[PDB]
């Protein structure tokens, strides 16, 4: 039903909006094939209506009218929401959760069936550059997985992974953007420290990060090869790299991923 | 100094390396100009010849002929070779031709002395020109006009973003946008290593690392927000992200990156 | 639970220490209360008696009489003494009287158990109550009404700013706003020492340090800007400010402050 | 050198930037000056024009006319531009006019040489002038009178606190009160980040951070106590505050701040 399927969003937050916008913009879905439900927030109703999507008055009606249901409510609220909708969550409907930290075992127990996909996107869904990972429930089919890959492909990239990896993933793709935000600010501060105007420094920092990551994503090269490509003999770049290595830069980043992943596990 | 005709100028590349090829490809692909308006010269490199010919560009046998036939000349030879190349061409570098250098570390004062005139623009692109995401900066010689600058904006816009700055900033720029990609390549590797340390398969860890960095930078470039606001947006109370961020801070992560920029900039100054 | 009369309620302080004095002075100075509407009890301390009497407040001879005559009772005895004080008063702590605790580290669950009812508000002020610049947070007991909260907001608004938070945040609040002033006192002394190290006279260095900190915090409070944006506003290219900031970052200054808040919060939990 | 009429002097701003605006607003708001006694000149810049006009101040078309019409002339152009601005105005800078520079890093010796006379006061305000909480210091040229100084005390008192110091201290003052606000902006962000690390919501953490810093500085400015005494006042035995302080001390927090001031001061001297 991939071509004509109806998608329903339970939870009308930013992630749902990003998905909806991405799918419409990429032609995966038309707005008439999407529904959401909102209560008592005007800004959010307007967000969906302004892209041509119908906002219904209840979660129940969104589920009834949807082949695929995406849950994006706050993780702490999800169990009760799925609970309440359970009679309507028939096995013919593919359920998807984007809730951070909620395992597949639990999603399946709450819904009462295993036709469930978990996707963990990250913050960059907003600009269509999410790093997402999906895990499949016990009854999710290969076709269900392709549908979801096509849907989340509209907001970034998507990879498959076993549910047991999702803590670590959270420490890397989930939390990693913050590490890069710090890097970007620090690079701009560095520019300014070196005598650059602040606006130029920040512009350059952000676009430098973007370009390097683009090289990494497109080049097919190991990052060490990419580093080798730009480190001319005795040049400026190696001088900067050397400072990084003196400080144990790589290990600091390893430490951040490990700590975030451990925190993820502790938070359950 | 006659204005360069914006819609019909011809472009000549002296130096037929990867940056030239990126600029030429980009400019043709983006419709800035058609291959028939572009010339390069290549001496006994049939591989580089094929690269230019295969996008519809005429390869001439001499630098001299490229310059004669061109309103705008882009010099992308290795920096160490640029002086002699400009001195040899000098009689042909008349003031009606806009000259551009992409050579790293060569200051405008020198370009102008070598050429004998001031109708010269300097651009410093970076390695991401290969994927059309360069961070470039341009500085204007004493006779380069606003219209010259715009012509160059539109040309280097094809390989990434381009900003203007005074030539005196170019050492610091070199340390930030020129060198910065290597800092990010390290960061990507380290993030991947970290993923693996936390139990992730390597291919997934590397895929996620690169795309996480790409996404965050895309947020920074598009959101209109300060990076501190972006960080605040993703750091939930007592959550995983703030745990990771705290580790960064404990270690002085920001100051490490500042140190790298400052060092690279200082090296740039040293190298002249 | 009868509403407390917003314009005419009487306020009683059990515990006549500095915080009580600051609240009383603040409320009188701001016109929230007149001194005739405030009572306290002081057993053998003519110094504290003088402090209250000198601002027009009646000092009674027993806690019991303060409670009987008061609609709102503020407990500000030392935290280790509070349980026994509340237990002794319990027969008088009828549900028509709003109880307030400013005791550090005593949770709402305990306050309510001791008093035998839930018409209780907990506040954690900080030391700057003495100059009307407290950072205070309040948490509501299970029977405290919105009107009770507003009454307390107004009262603690007389000595600084007051925010509302769930009692589960109070360890962390204790580590930040409760303990934070000491971190800033260190910072002020260190800034002054740094001024002197740079050649300034001591009185000027200390004056400048305090006022620099005051001014910056005032900018932070009033500007509506993120602190990163504020920092960007003052860091001129290659200038003195960024030189100083770079030193902070090399040393992991930010992480150190994060560590102090975390440690203090952890200690608060430990002492629970 | 005729005395500047204390109650009726006219004030002229050469440079219409943010600092000039803060001074003008402050002096008007505080009743030191009426807007009709203030002039500025804005050339080719309407946003600045609106800022001054919207507080009742006449914007003239030339620096020359501002100088002619003013008893006191405040120079607040970018430091790099000040020399040429003063040289151009020099014929109009008669010894009956009190000259004032707020330019960072420009020494009195230079101001006096450029103007050709010594009836000059230098002030170094800081960024908190925007909120009336500048830390400012003044130094007197060789012909500035005590009455000139008092006039400038009153004028800069309207945007914060103002002290007097010998010109030789100004590099250190620049590293402390000029640059210091950035150190505190970092501190505020870090304290907020720490609160989030400890489980606080971001908005509360930032609000608490800022107000904690404000309060502590207010305690320092008003209490008449040494910062060490203030620290002792809030460090209860084995309590949360001393646990946080201990973490700061383990990390050498005070030394880090000293380093920042020293580095900023050294940079100031370096920049001349
Ligand atoms: Cl290099
Ligand atoms: Cl998080
Ligand atoms: Cl500065
Ligand atoms: Cl304490």
Author numbering:
A (entry chain G): 7 to 274
B (entry chain H), C (entry chain I), D (entry chain J): 3 to 274
Publication excerpt:
The pathway preference appears to depend on nitrogen availability, being the ornithine route preferred under nitrogen-rich conditions. Both routes converge at the generation of P5C, which in the final step is reduced to L-proline by P5C reductase (P5CR, EC 1.5.1.2). Here we report the high-resolution crystal structure of P5CR from M. truncatula (Mt), a model legume plant. The donut-shaped decamer of MtP5CR can be described as a pentamer of symmetric, bean-like dimers that are related to each other by a five-fold NCS axis. The catalytic centers of P5CRs are located between the dinucleotide-binding domain (N-terminal) and the dimerization domain (C-terminal).
In this paper, the term “unliganded” refers to the structure without a coenzyme or L-proline, despite the fact that it actually contains non-protein and non-solvent ligands. In apo structures (unliganded and complexed with L-proline) loop L3 occupies a part of the coenzyme-binding site. Moreover, in these two complexes the imidazole ring of His45 lies in a structural position similar to that of adenine from NAD(P)+. On the contrary, in the crystal structures of unliganded MtP5CR and both holo complexes, chloride anions are present in the catalytic center. Also, highly positive peaks in Fo–Fc electron density maps appear if a water molecule is placed instead of the chloride, suggesting a larger atom. The presence of chlorides was verified with the use of anomalous difference electron density map, resulting from diffraction data collected at 1.7196 Å wavelength. In the crystal structures of unliganded MtP5CR and both holo-complexes, chloride anions were found in the catalytic centers at the same structural positions as the carboxyl groups of L-prolines in the MtP5CR/L-proline complex. Therefore, as inferred from the crystal structures, chloride ions should be rather inhibitory as they compete for the same site with the carboxylic group of L-proline and, most probably, P5C. Indeed, the concentration of Cl− ions in the crystallization drop when the crystals were harvested should have exceeded 340 mM. As a consequence, we propose that the Cl− found in the crystal structure reflects the inhibitory role of Cl−.
